[PDB]
Amino acid sequence: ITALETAIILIAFVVVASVFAFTILSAGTFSTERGKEAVYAGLSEVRSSIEIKGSVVIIGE
């Protein structure tokens, strides 16, 4: 007797673990993507800049 039912719980747990493992794999991929994008965005902002060259001229009507 004891042999047969042990099989059922045996399958039941591995299926749950596999489904959980699949979710972690998908979740981990999204997290890394978000982190990578943040670094690229930060570097772009620091680099961009404008400076004024020469004197300012004003024209009277």
Add this chain to the structure above:
Amino acid sequence: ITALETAIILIAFVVVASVFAFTILSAGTFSTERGKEAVYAGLSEVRSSIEIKGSVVIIGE
């Protein structure tokens, strides 16, 4: 577990540096502009003298 955690803290520190960096850039531009005004202001004052020519005359009522 440690992977998912580390992404969240990592983004937090990058954003803080980005905001701090932006503040420095804007702050530094103001300082340079103010320093430049002083030199032009100083030079203008030195050359703006005036001089008396001739003799002084008084008219009797």
